[PDB]
Design a protein around this ligand. Structure first.
Ligand SMILES: Cn1nc(C(N)=O)c2cc(F)ccc21
Ligand SMILES: [Zn+2]
Length: 140
């Protein structure tokens, strides 16, 4: 699990989104596994506006932050799991690194801030749902 908190917004994997998230929705996309919901108290997080391919992610199935090189956000085939079938997820970034389903929500950060959250992976890969193209998060 895990979320970002850019102001009074909560950014989560679309598949871990709660009833409250859907009952206080802002925007959502199944192909990306992203959903943003409203909050009453503000958050502690800046979103990266950049093309970095280096950063650090949190991996819950190891209790560690790992430094990684990561690919640019693209359309990637990801194998089956408890939450989705074997499909293409868009705006996915692979790094080489350990990941399992429950690692979803872990933050990837670079010098420019929060880059994205863990969304896909397998076979020593990890895909981060990029948030960097979502320029509207910074305001309103
Ligand atoms: C980080 N991660 N997300 C998923 C997923 N959403 O299906 C996944 C599936 C895997 F077999 C291994 C790792 C994974
Ligand atoms: Zn950056």
């Amino acid at each position: 699990s895990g979320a970002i908190y850019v102001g009074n917004y909560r950014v989560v994997n679309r598949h871990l989104a709660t009833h409250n998230d859907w009952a206080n929705l802002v925007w959502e996309d199944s192909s990306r596994d992203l959903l943003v919901s409203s909050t009453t108290a503000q958050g502690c997080d800046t979103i990266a506006r950049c093309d970095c391919q280096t950063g650090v992610y949190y991996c819950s199935s190891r209790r560690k932050h790992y430094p990684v090189s990561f690919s640019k956000p693209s359309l990637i085939f990801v194998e089956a799991s408890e939450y989705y079938p074997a499909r293409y997820q868009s705006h996915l970034m692979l790094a080489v690194g350990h990941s399992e389903p429950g690692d979803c929500g872990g933050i990837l950060r670079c010098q420019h801030g929060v880059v994205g959250i863990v969304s896909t992976g397998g076979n020593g890969l990890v895909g981060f749902a990029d948030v960097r193209d979502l320029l509207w998060l910074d305001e309103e």
